[PDB]
Amino acid sequence: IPEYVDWRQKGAVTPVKNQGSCGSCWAFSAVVTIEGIIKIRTGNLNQYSEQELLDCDRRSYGCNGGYPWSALQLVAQYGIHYRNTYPYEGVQRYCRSREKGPYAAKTDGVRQVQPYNQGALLYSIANQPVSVVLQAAGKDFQLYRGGIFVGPCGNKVDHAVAAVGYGPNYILIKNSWGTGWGENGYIRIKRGTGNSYGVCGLYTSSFYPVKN
């Protein structure tokens, strides 16, 4: 795998979104890995619905929490609609897939990256965007305005985000807070620290969509 990977340069990531006051990070996270693998595989970049995952994933908890592996599984099983046809409302409501007609895309499966293993994650990111969790509660993470973030942060993961690249000393992450947070909505987290947890617990649980 190469020294630098940046899926935005390959035209495989859409504009940064803002989840607002809904704890829908898990759905935002799962959707940037669906947008990236559809572009990688079909050549077309499209935006997909976070609201659909929020309303329809019965294992997750709507606003206040969920699982991007559960969200990723629904799309393999069923599929997902364009963001346009099912726009973000920031509130969980009834599942409306049926009403919005046929799915725009569908996936074939969900895989997990071997945890607490930096090289395993970096090999998955070299192939497609990956869903990743981290501890985002400390005000150092919240007030991030740029640079390679080294912490301080613990490993009490609470925020799902997506990794879309890496470099020699960092992993590149798409967050769902505004384009005004961090580096136009992105954060480069220090890697190669020797901590198996990863900085802020970044190697705790990472999943990616399989599309054939």
Partner: peptide, 5 residues
């Protein structure tokens, strides 16, 4: 304190 969301 801090866990899934």
């Amino acid at each position: 304190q801090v866990v899934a969301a």
